UniProtKB/Swiss-Prot annotation:
Keywords: Chromophore, Luminescence, Photoprotein
Impact noted for substituting H147D: In Cerulean; leads to improved quantum yield, a higher extinction coefficient and is 2.5-fold brighter than ECFP
Tissue and organ distribution: Photocytes.
UniProt effect for mutating V223R: In Azurite; shifts the excitation and emission spectra to shorter wavelengths and increases quantum yields compared to BFP
Protein name, entry field: Green fluorescent protein
Protein family per UniProt: Belongs to the GFP family.
Length: 232
């Protein structure tokens, strides 16, 4: 049987909405996204448009901010799926992202069902970025590397936490590190699944829509959980 009510909400393809309100170094911007997720296969397909004009930061720097409830949790790990267990009421996802030798993003998001759509609504604030740096200078290549992140329960606050470093390729062959600190809290009061320590493995591909004039990003992702019981 299912390990949570929310688990049952992801057995098929689910429509997704993303809305982001951003302010980086005083530049306000808005992004809207639409797409589909299929947690049976850990897959996400999304398209994002900057509705205020040109995006003042590089698209790759917002990938982690723009849905871990769509991770594929294999059968022997469904008891560790916090993200679906918080649904439908959802969870708050808070981060600070520290860009090495540059500014920081602070983000607060709510991920929940609204009607039949899984919706991620984000407030992002960035400060202390260098005008001529990798971020405001758009020096990041339009690609994305794979990353494995270590999920841990936050027993006292009834949620999960994770730290991880994103490596962004720069146009000169160097890397821009984006150090992520993340805290997830249920929105509702019902029971949730607090996981054993485990990994989420994510692969991401960035592309463009040939028919899209606006500044935009097409994002395809594969996310799967991997346990470390090592029963051998």
């Amino acid at each position: 049987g299912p390990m949570s009510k929310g688990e049952e909400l992801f057995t098929g393809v689910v429509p997704i909405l993303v809305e982001l309100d951003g302010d980086v170094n005083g530049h306000k911007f808005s992004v809207s996204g639409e797409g589909e997720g299929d947690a049976t296969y850990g897959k996400l397909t999304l398209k994002f448009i900057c509705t205020t004009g040109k995006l003042p930061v590089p698209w790759p720097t917002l990938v982690t901010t723009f849905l871990q409830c769509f991770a594929r949790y294999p059968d022997h790990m469904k008891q560790h799926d916090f993200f679906k267990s918080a649904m439908p009421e959802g969870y708050v996802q808070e981060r600070t992202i520290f860009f090495k030798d540059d500014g920081n993003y602070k983000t607060r998001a709510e991920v929940k069902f609204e009607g039949d759509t899984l919706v991620n609504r984000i407030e992002l604030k960035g400060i202390d970025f260098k005008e001529d740096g990798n971020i405001l200078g758009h020096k990041l290549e339009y690609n994305y590397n794979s990353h494995n992140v270590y999920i841990m329960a936050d027993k006292q606050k009834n949620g999960i936490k994770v730290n991880f470093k994103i490596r962004h390729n720069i146009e000169d062959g160097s890397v821009q590190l984006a150090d992520h600190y993340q805290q997830n809290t249920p929105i509702g009061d019902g029971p949730v699944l607090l996981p054993d320590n485990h990994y989420l493995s994510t692969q991401s591909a960035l592309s463009k829509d040939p028919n899209e004039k606006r500044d935009h990003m097409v994002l395809l992702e594969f996310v799967t959980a991997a346990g470390i019981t090592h029963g051998m």
